[PDB]
Design a protein around this ligand. Structure first.
Ligand SMILES: [Cl-]
Ligand SMILES: [Cl-]
Ligand SMILES: [Cl-]
Ligand code: NA
Lengths: 450, 453, 448, 448
């Protein structure tokens, strides 16, 4: 009810920013070590600060640290506790530092660590997909455009689509990481300091490439948050497409995949209904990752220099986006490990819609017919085959009524198995082409037989 | 009477893309020439057929560049417009151009090439704006202005230091453009509809001919992927956020309340009855235009969310946002650079305002820490001294040494070299600080990096 | 040149020329009020009104040259009016700013656009109701988690979308009423000391009343935000229609076949019918969301009162409106050009045991606890899966192995046709319930 | 384990526990209808109602153990009910699904939250009107392009925000009415053949009527979308208040001083007063926009009818609602903890020639055309800029040199006080006009 109370609750950040504690401690140790080296604090002050910070870290890891809203945020929580433990030397940690450059440093360190963790998770999902592909390497499914059957494809070729998507995501994560890995520490409030700090020393100690060249930039920049949010959002769109695909494959209309009981829900009344809830939720969680990105874009839009309290609002969306994408990645990996393909159902489905048509057109082109004539002939033959009706079941006599170009060899180009084997272009679904790409990924991901 | 449209005509109005995708013509022609050359090399068309296609496509490109080409809605899109015109020009050979190709791999190829060219043009414009900003900084290298937190004056800084903030922002933007360009520069051409082909094409030849690093390794990915669009959109949006902050800053500096900056008449609007009113419209519109760049990004994120594999017609909606985003960001960059070349700083107005905000307080606290006083005591002392100044109506540099010595013995006559705004600025010394020698180092770096003479 | 680059960047006539009719109406009302208040003569007023009418006729005839060197729609019209009638044209500037003129014009444009959208929505609702009536007895699955859950009637499915669109029409009506207040007479932001009459112009332009605050009048764009949101939620509904119909057109579902006039195809696979209009409907919902985000972001953090940033409010509104009108209209065309495949659907239904919940309802009615009813029916479905039959093919004696409550009347609760007939709750898929709702909609849309 | 990882990813209780009151209200109404309809005994119904009341008391006393192994609010409450009362609890779910239950509960929660927001909006409007009344005579500049344009009264500026919030309240009212339709009785998606009565439960729960389509009932989240948008537009307004007050708190403007209780500072720079609460109000508008985008994107392209994706619609709604309530309340506290720096404001006004437009009005009233009046005034203002004086310090002789229409009455139109007094159009900043609008708002808000 007090104004001070209402403002305190509105402005407190510890409820969410306590997750930065490891990075805040690392940053404060590096700062103290540098201060001592530069003669701004004593070596005994450093010794006490380092030991006291390590004690606090241990207390937090053991869940014995009481986070307090009356201490506002992670930084003041940790520093007031340090003062309680070691006395007046703790008060020297503020020398030649502001909350403004401290928070920037801590957040960049947290984002760096979170990116490292995401990359491991992506590799794990890529491995899950490639292992699923190797286990189900011979299965043929329809390939779709406009959700219409277009050509036959190998199941491993489809799964490698998602592996390639995730590789571009990993690349964006690596590039983001490098760009963010510059140290804001030593910018102080915005202008730097006249005290004899060494910003190269703290940048090195904290694993940054070098110190940021402009103190105002250092305290005002949140591009690293934006870029990480965007990179999570693109990853999330890939997983939303995997979710759409697998929810469709789990339908009875498609009938291609059966999730295990452990990754689905059901009904006692309709025991055959198996709902793929985890992948629906993966699809749905792509939305909040997009919203998290919009939050911080809108937040930064039109802000003056240098530091503004508005930046407090960049933490929660980054934490949410990160937790969400990590979950989406890991659940998709578990789902991939807990699905079986319905081989008879798939086989029964493939004869519908003449997936061999393009192979037959390629046959005619190889025999010298122009592409348009080839397409016209094949469409007429398909037109003789409206029903169950299959091109490979037509007689040669029937084909010769349309063109003398057909010969007995045609049957090696018809049916869905021959069609897959006839694709030969780089990146194609041809069996040998897919075998080459599986080999690249078994090498790159260090997949073993064990 | 009123013409009565057919269903097909009503649908065609809704689905046509030529009204916007005509802007892909150069890339579409380059892609088709590369394809035809490959077809001939692989024996799929004759060398005669290839030569007819190449010369006909070059004629068509000349016609478009002359504004003598009639774009037709009844031909749907840029690809069919060009190829139907080619068939009208050369006849039968044109009909072999589409051998071992789909619109699905063609469109993806054409759009990547367009985005690659657009990124190259944006990086050039960014460097031009960085130069404009560095030149402004050099021209005004000695000017002191406040630095702000919470829109409250916090420390004194050099104007070149503030301007280099934007140069550093733009450098990260340029880095994002370079990284985006490299990731997009792989060729979808030869994925066909989605699965590849059994016809003997050469995807490495077309990739090389078109300046791509390599062919994409997955045909389904090649026709289904629009990450390059998303990444380019995001990179534009972040650039736009930087320019929106530049806009906010310069709209504030042009106010009478700040009074720091006067735009020229060529980059402002005014009032004949209020001749001192100078509205900084260009920078207001730069700030505003950041919004549509963010909207463009959201469009394509939302478009791709939840789509099944592989190619879907929804992807046609990826073009207009990318074109809008690109045209907007290029305008925003260029206009910001023109504004930077057409502003004057109001030196007397700035100077008169600086001395009364105790902006030297942190410098005095640094003095005390240098003389061996712990931080907390340094602040205690400085806060008390500023309190005396508020009482006396004076600046810290007006206090006697005797008065300071009433709170601490450490003060000596050298303290006066640490007080006042000019001396405060001079005392910043850390790397990346506003110190005059620090800033001079950074300006030297930028002058060399941008090849400024 | 610098002036040239800035002129190109700041020009708005390339997009804002679409406000011409509203700009002219607003200037006519302004001139009429100036004469009524004695600030201009009736002769000057008459010259202005006739000149503006002449210009409107020129624009409608495609004989008016829009000029970038006259910046925007307002200066293009007024400079042309000066050329046409001379000094009286200049009197329009009396007691007016571009700040209040543009806000007035844009509200009028939005009001007219919303009126058009409501007409289009009703047309699409009729198209859906007509498709429902043509297929009123068709049973299809109802889905949860993209799994078959219950049997439903196709008209019940289509009425989902009609009810969605009714909410959208309601938002349009509410939005229109809230924007229908006049900003004209706010001038630059503070009003005027000249003896204008803002009640007269408000009435003349069909507004409910003048806005009560001049700063608000020039600084407000909520009508744009609300209209953009309303368009975005309508687009969401159409994106779900698009998803459903792209699924239904798939071979895997096989529920419907679009006509050749509303699909794209393949010489080589003449059965490959792509539903491109409905995919593009789905995809266009994205730009309508992005247009909303644009104007939200534009307004966020702006100081009062008028700022040049507001020039950016027009393009997104025009885009959003053009887009949603297109989506609505093409969805109606698609609805008129689809044929269901009853044979395929009907043959797919028996394996799904969609009558299971109806059998559970039978047992609940006979006094069995619901949880027990579900377990027992699930066991019977298991028996059916094992025997390869439907529930209706089990003997009564087989059911009695699980409970004595089953009696010969059970067979009237089994099979999909019986199941649909047994739904009876208000708003349910039951045949009579759906017939009631169709009757409601036929009357409400004046279908003959 | 796998089961464990899925359980954690899919559990909703950590956030959806906040629906408990609505869940219990809905369940009691459902049980009451079941008993009236003969589906459960009256004794079973009485046991359920008493047990639900008991559980509500436990929750309100912080004695209820929420469990992730019971997934969500519905199962948490109902498994607890079964532990408390036994078998009768297991009849509660007769003729109901979680699909219609959750839609009902969320609508009720939204209806309550909207009611709470409207109260908080009215409180902020009163705070603003009270601030306006205390400072009713204060003149400040009005701005276009962040350049001083005309003199206005501080109450007129604050009434801008009150009018903005009135449109917000209108949107909240309209959104509440549209959401106030009952989905209960749609069951999984198709309704039921059990003899429920949906009108009875709609009545009991305060809904206008039952939703007319069961598939719509389980698949619709437009009420979330509309509530999220309405929060986002309110947040826009507050972000502009935030921008304005952070500017006014600057030393460059120097208009406003926040109290220590609503600001932060520096012990070494004791006149530095950071307006953190209003900066955070401005910044929190962003997450409200992001919450909207989340649910728009979630709904885009989703098939019918119920999908697990919808679990993601709660967190954004709860966040958006908590955020906007805080933004509203903190803005109201800030309004009660600011003082205007009257000498600083007064000293800044004369140099701007803010009376120029009032002088132009004077000349138009005396019969000069618009452009001539501006030509004359601009010349005079130029003279004053040279001489460093105000228009009101010019001699009538030197004015008459420029035009004979000037007379001694001109001085009553010069200077900022007279300029403000001379505005007369409805909604203008004129003293009498603003007094009228303040009176209107004092009555409307029941201020005593
Ligand atoms: Cl009036
Ligand atoms: Cl009754
Ligand atoms: Cl009922
Ligand atoms: Na506008």
């Amino acid at each position: 009810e007090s104004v001070t109370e209402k403002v305190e609750k509105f402005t407190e950040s510890i409820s969410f920013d306590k997750v930065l504690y490891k990075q805040d401690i690392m940053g404060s140790k590096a700062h103290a070590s540098m201060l001592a080296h530069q003669g701004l604090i004593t070596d005994s002050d450093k010794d006490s600060i380092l030991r006291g910070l390590d004690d606090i870290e241990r207390q937090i890891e053991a869940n014995k640290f009481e986070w307090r809203t009356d201490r506002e945020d992670v930084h003041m929580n940790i520093e007031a506790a340090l003062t309680d433990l070691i006395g007046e030397p703790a008060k020297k940690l503020h020398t030649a530092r502001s909350r403004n450059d401290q928070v920037a440093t801590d957040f960049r360190l947290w984002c760096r660590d979170a990116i490292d963790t995401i990359i491991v998770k992506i590799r794990n999902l890529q491995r899950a997909l490639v292992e699923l592909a190797l286990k189900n390497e011979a299965l043929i499914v329809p390939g779709y455009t406009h959700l219409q059957r277009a050509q036959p494809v190998l199941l491993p070729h489809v799964l490698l689509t998602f592996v390639e998507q995730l590789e571009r995501d990993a690349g964006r994560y690596v590039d983001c990481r490098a760009r963010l890995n510059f140290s804001p520490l030593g910018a102080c409030a915005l202008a730097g300091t006249g005290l004899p700090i060494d910003r190269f020393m703290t940048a090195n100690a904290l694993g940054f490439t070098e110190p940021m060249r402009n103190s105002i930039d250092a305290v005002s920049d949140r591009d690293f948050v934006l870029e990480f949010l965007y990179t999570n959002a693109n990853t999330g769109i890939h997983l939303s497409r995997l979710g759409e695909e697998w929810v469709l494959w789990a339908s009875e209309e498609f009938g291609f995949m059966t999730p295990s009981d452990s990754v689905s829900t059901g009904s006692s009344i309709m025991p055959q209904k198996k709902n793929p809830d985890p992948m629906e939720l993966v699809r749905g969680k792509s939305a909040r990752v997009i919203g998290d990105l919009v939050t911080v874009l809108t937040l930064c839009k039109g802000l003056p220099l240098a530091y503004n309290r508005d930046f407090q609002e960049d933490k929660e969306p980054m934490f949410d986006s990160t937790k969400t994408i990590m979950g989406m990645i890991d659940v998709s990996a578990e789902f991939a490990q807990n699905v079986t393909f319905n081989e008879d159902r798939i086989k029964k489905s493939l004869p519908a819609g003449h997936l061999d048509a393009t192979t037959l057109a390629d046959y005619l082109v190889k025999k010298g017919m122009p592409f348009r004539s080839s397409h016209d002939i094949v469409g007429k033959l398909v037109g003789v085959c409206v029903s169950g009706c299959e091109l490979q079941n037509l007689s040669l006599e029937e084909m010769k009524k349309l063109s003398p170009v057909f010969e007995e060899d045609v049957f090696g180009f018809l049916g869905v198995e021959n069609s897959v084997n006839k694709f030969s272009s780089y990146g194609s679904t041809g069996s040998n082409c897919v075998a080459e790409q599986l080999g690249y990924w078994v090498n790159k991901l260090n997949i073993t037989s064990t």
